[PDB]
């Protein structure tokens, strides 16, 4: 029965000036200095940027008041250039809650040869949703503390953040290749009981929706709306990019620039949430299309980011949030 809560499940909406609390409650530039920069370097998995942004990560949750529990998933698996280790990061508020919504991106970064003394660092690819994600749970802090009291007036159902290890091919992409984390991980989740002492269900019954922020960060993304199954969800988002922007809130945003579009696409894009999809997780994938004029180009770095873009997302994802989880 509880599986199915997902399907009905309804947001909380935000009235004006609650909106107007959480715009002001977000500072890109506090995401910029704590959050963003400390990622800004190589980390394909292995290099010492694997280990300080695993480190990073942890340490930025760990200061906040919100009850997060922190897991490392970390496993061995053979890649063209033998085998190595890799390390998922799982935050989740309320382990044994029955339902999570889940937001989550990829930490790695992919390896590039050094070319003219310069080092490929993802900066939308993904150091900026990872900081979104890391700047979210700050400024939600308060709001999800109360998480951690129990209540027979609400749904059991609270939230997770997933940092994926090893998204981002050796070589050439390919389904041995690729998301060595998330293949990893939702298999896992696949074979886990949920709740404990559970039967049937798993762990990825209890995944309310995957939200996969990838290659943000770029200025005028548009986002098309991928699946049926997570559509409505994904017209919460225009709604809220809507209101906001009416009540003044987003910076340097036009209604013409608008970033959740009403089309959807026409190819299949692989990324971390592949093996959660076709194990039936409903998906909301906020990647771009088309992708950043700097992908897989030593200019996707921090130059090239555009802040204003950045900020206006973080508002609207953090309402979305917070509608979701009604608080
Ligand atoms: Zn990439």
Partial sequence: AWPEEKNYHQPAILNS?????????????????????????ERYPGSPGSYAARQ?????????????????????????????????????????????????????????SHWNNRVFVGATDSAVPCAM???????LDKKLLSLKTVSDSKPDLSLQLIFFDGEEAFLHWSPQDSLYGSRHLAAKMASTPHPPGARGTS???????????DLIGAPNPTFPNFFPNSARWFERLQAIEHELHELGLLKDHSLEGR?????????????????????????????????????????????????????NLNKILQVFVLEYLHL
């Avoid at 994600?133 to 400024?139: F, K, P, Q, T, V």
């Avoid at 971390?272 to 076709?278: A, E, N, S, T």
Wanted: with cysteine; charged share 20%.
């Fill in 17 to 41: 000036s609650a909106l107007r609390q959480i715009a002001e409650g977000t500072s890109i530039s506090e995401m910029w200095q704590n959050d963003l920069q400390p990622l800004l370097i």
């Fill in 56 to 112: 990073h990560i942890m340490q930025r949750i760990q200061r906040l008041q919100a009850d997060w529990v922190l897991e490392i998933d970390t496993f061995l698996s053979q890649t063209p250039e033998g085998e190595r280790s890799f390390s998922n990061i799982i935050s989740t508020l309320n382990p044994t809650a029955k339902r999570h919504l889940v937001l989550a991106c990829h930490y790695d970064s992919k390896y590039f």
């Fill in 133 to 139: 994600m890391l700047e979210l749970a700050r400024a």
């Fill in 203 to 213: 762990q990825l019954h209890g995944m309310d929706l995957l939200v996969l922020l």
């Fill in 259 to 311: 970033y959740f579009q009403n089309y959807s696409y026409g190819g299949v894009i692989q990324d971390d949430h592949i093996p959660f999809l076709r194990r039936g997780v409903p998906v909301l994938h906020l990647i771009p299309s088309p992708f950043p004029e700097v992908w897989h180009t030593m200019d996707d770095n921090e130059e090239n980011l555009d802040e204003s873009t950045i900020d």
